Amino acid sequence: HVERLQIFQHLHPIV
Amino acid sequence: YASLTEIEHLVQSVCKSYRETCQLRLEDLLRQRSNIFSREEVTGYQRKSMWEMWERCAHHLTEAIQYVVEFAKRLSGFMELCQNDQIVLLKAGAMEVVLVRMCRAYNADNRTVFFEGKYGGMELFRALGCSELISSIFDFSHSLSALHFSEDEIALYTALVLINAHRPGLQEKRKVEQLQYNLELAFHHHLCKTHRQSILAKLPPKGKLRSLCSQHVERLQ
Amino acid sequence: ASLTEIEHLVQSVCKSYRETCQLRLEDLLRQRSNIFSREEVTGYQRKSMWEMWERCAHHLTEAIQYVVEFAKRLSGFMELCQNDQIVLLKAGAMEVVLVRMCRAYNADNRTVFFEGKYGGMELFRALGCSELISSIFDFSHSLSALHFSEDEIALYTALVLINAHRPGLQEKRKVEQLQYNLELAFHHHLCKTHRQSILAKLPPKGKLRSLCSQHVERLQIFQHLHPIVVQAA
Ligand SMILES: CC(C)CCC[C@H](CCCC(C)(C)O)[C@H]1CC[C@H]2[C@@H]3CC=C4C[C@@H](O)CC[C@]4(C)[C@H]3CC[C@]12C
Ligand SMILES: CC(C)CCC[C@H](CCCC(C)(C)O)[C@H]1CC[C@H]2[C@@H]3CC=C4C[C@@H](O)CC[C@]4(C)[C@H]3CC[C@]12C
Numbered sequence: 251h252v253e254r255l256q257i258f259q260h261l262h263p264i265v
Numbered sequence: 266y267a268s269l270t271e272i273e274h275l276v277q278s279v280c281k282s283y284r285e286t287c288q289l290r291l292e293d294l295l296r297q298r299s300n301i302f303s304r305e306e307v308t309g310y311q312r313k314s315m316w317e318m319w320e321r322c323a324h325h326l327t328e329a330i331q332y333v334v335e336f337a338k339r340l341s342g343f344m345e346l347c348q349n350d351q352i353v354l355l356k357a358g359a360m361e362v363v364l365v366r367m368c369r370a371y372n373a374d375n376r377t378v379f380f381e382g383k384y385g386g387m388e389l390f391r392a393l394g395c396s397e398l399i400s401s402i403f404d405f406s407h408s409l410s411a412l413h414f415s416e417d418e419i420a421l422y423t424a425l426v427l428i429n430a431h432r433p434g435l436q437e438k439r440k441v442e443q444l445q446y447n448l449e450l451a452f453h454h455h456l457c458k459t460h461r462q463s464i465l466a467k468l469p470p471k472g473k474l475r476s477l478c479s480q481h482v483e484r485l486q
Numbered sequence: 487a488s489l490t491e492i493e494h495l496v497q498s499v500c501k502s503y504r505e506t507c508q509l510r511l512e513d514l515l516r517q518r519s520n521i522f523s524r525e526e527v528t529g530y531q532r533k534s535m536w537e538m539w540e541r542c543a544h545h546l547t548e549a550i551q552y553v554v555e556f557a558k559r560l561s562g563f564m565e566l567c568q569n570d571q572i573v574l575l576k577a578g579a580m581e582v583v584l585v586r587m588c589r590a591y592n593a594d595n596r597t598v599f600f601e602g603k604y605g606g607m608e609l610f611r612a613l614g615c616s617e618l619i620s621s622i623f624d625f626s627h628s629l630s631a632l633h634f635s636e637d638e639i640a641l642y643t644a645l646v647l648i649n650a651h652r653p654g655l656q657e658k659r660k661v662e663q664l665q666y667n668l669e670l671a672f673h674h675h676l677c678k679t680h681r682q683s684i685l686a687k688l689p690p691k692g693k694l695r696s697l698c699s700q701h702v703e704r705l706q707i708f709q710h711l712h713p714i715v716v717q718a719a
Contacts, residue, residue: 251356251482252330254568258352259554260334263547263716264705265576327718335715 266447269454275341276421276451282339283420288332291369291416294379298372302385311391318392321381323486326363333359333366337427342444350441353434358427360482361474364402365423368409376403398481405469405477412464421452426474495561495671496641502559503640508552511589511636514599518592522605531611538612539708541601546583547716553582555719557647562664570661573654578647580702581694584622585643588634591626598626618700625689625697632684641672646694 266272302310310318334355337343343351370379377384390399414422425448430441456462522530530538557563557575564571590599597604607619634642645668650661676682 252359254352254356255554255558255571256327256330257334257356257359258572259551259718260331261338261348261351261355262576263714264543264550264709265579324717331715331718 266450272447272451272454275447276417276455278339278341279424279448279451280417280420282336283416283423286332286336286339287366287369287416288329289370289379294369297379298374298384300383301375301377302383302389306383307385307389310385310389313392315392315394318390319484322390322393325381329363329366330359333362333423333427336362336423340424340428340444342440343428346440346444347436349434349436353432354427354429354441357432358429360478361426362423364405364474364478365409365419365426367402368406368414369419371403371406371410373407373410376407378403378406401477401480405473408469412467414464415459415461417455417459418461418464421448421455422468424448425452489674492667492670492674495667496637496675498561499644499668499671500637500640502556503636503643506552506556506559507586507589507636508549509590509599514590517599518594518604520603521595521597522603522609526603527605527609530605530609533612535612535614536712538610540712540714542610542613543705543709543714544716545601547714548719549583549586550579551718553579553586553643553647556582556643560644560648560664560668562667563648566660566664567656570655570657573652574647574649574661577652578649580698581646582643584625584694584698585629585639585646587622588626588629589639591623591630593627593630596623596627598623615704618704621697621700625693628689632687634684635679635681637675637679638681638684641668641675642688644668645672649691 266275313321337351337355337359343354346354367378372378372384375384375386377386380389387396387399387403393399412418425445428441428444428448430438430445432441435441453462453465456465554575557571557579563574566574587598591597592599592604595604595606597606598609600609607616607623610616610619613619632638645665648661648665648668650658650665652661655661673682673685676685
């Protein structure tokens with residue numbers, strides 16, 4: 251598994 | 266979906282999504298097969314510190330995962346999933362998709378992979394001190410090469426690697442199932458339209474993707 | 487509880503910022519004489535709004551990455567659960583980029599360091615939102631009046647992030663404990679450097695929020711009409 255954070259940073263790079 | 270024409274719209278959308286995010290174009294990988302590291306270039310890689318080789322590889326793997334995440338965001342109903350499930354699906358399956366995508370960069374004629382502009386064999390990674398891990402993934406790529414995976418087959422297959430309602434932690438498991446079942450039918454439908462239903466028995470077995478990636482997900486960064 | 491532990495927290499938060507400040511203060515100051523010429527500014531203004539949005543979205547995305555990296559290095563942040571880490575960074579990361587911007591803002595000529603040179607807000611004319619641009623240029627100008635040191639920025643942006651009142655936190659007590667220890671570090675360090683006078687001149691928590699809320703509306707309509715993908719560090 252990729253860490254949840256890195257995966258969030260790939261999902262929303264600007265949020 | 267409840268109609269076969271909507272499934273075909275799914276098939277085309279999944280394939281367009283992958284064409285837009287495949288990162289390395291197939292035709293460019295193929296022309297590049299004759300571009301191979303010299304002994305001197307391979308030696309330059311093997312003299313590098315494990316730390317430098319890990320930084321390079323972490324970089325290339327991060328960029329690869331980014332293209333996979335972009336692929337998922339374009340899958341037809343993935344963005345309708347709650348944010349928790351999108352993260353659960355991606356953290357469980359992005360490595361596996363990256364491993365499936367590697368077979369396009371893999372040349373079975375000489376057992377080399379496209380790495381940083383050229384093709385090289387597994388000895389390129391000697392400084393990592395991970396012979397069996399590296400050897401496991403060249404062999405797996407070698408198996409998938411035999412299937413002569415088309416781009417649409419890879420697209421449909423990696424969509425199912427990600428949209429797997431069995432991932433623990435899902436908050437809306439039923440929503441992912443509807444996504445998964447429709448993608449499965451799309452995959453089977455498309456394989457019949459191209460007379461390629463023979464691959465369905467040749468695919469990598471249950472948890473062979475998971476086991477290969479679970480052996481690699483253990484590293485200090 | 488001891489002042490030895492608070493001082494260590496100060497030193498650590500400051501070290502984290504130094505390693506994730508993205509642009510060295512020394513380099514930003516040395517580059518102040520490097521200003522875009524009238525023709526280069528015209529070249530930026532002739533650009534399409536979409537080309538300007540792609541560039542800006544790229545440089546902002548990179549800025550967020552450094553802020554995420556700074557968070558991960560804050561003592562105790564990685565001991566929060568994955569959900570609260572996400573909650574804090576999405577409520578706070580942009581507010582931190584707006585604060586960090588004042589290091590790259592030259593108050594003498596009202597320019598910002600953008601893509602290698604300094605230019606004024608006229609650089610961003612193609613975007614068609616001079617009101618939003620004026621707002622963040624004026625906010626930077628006010629913070630420049632304060633002469634934030636690098637360590638004041640470090641400690642202040644840590645508390646922008648580590649805010650126990652963000653909705654959706656699951657372990658609010660654990661964030662409360664983090665926020666308090668950071669407040670102690672910030673307040674103590676202001677006494678050690680005789681800078682207690684800036685506490686009352688900082689923008690209230692609502693102004694960062696209102697200023698970033700004004701932009702996130704334009705950023706989401708722009709991002710969904712065509713997105714962007716940027717390499718990490
Ligand atoms: C489960 C695997 C996917 C894990 C990655 C293996 C390997 C290095 C592992 C180093 C470690 C310390 C963990 O043992 C990585 C390093 C660089 C990667 C390639 C980078 C880019 C692409 C392009 C993409 O279009 C297809 C995939 C491919 C070829 C990556 C494959 C995996 C590589 C070799
Ligand atoms: C801080 C935000 C609340 C505001 C973003 C403003 C601006 C784009 C605005 C376009 C829009 C359509 C939304 O109106 C962005 C684009 C590029 C950004 C800079 C890039 C890099 C750095 C370095 C960093 O070390 C400090 C901040 C700074 C200077 C960014 C400031 C904000 C800029 C100009």
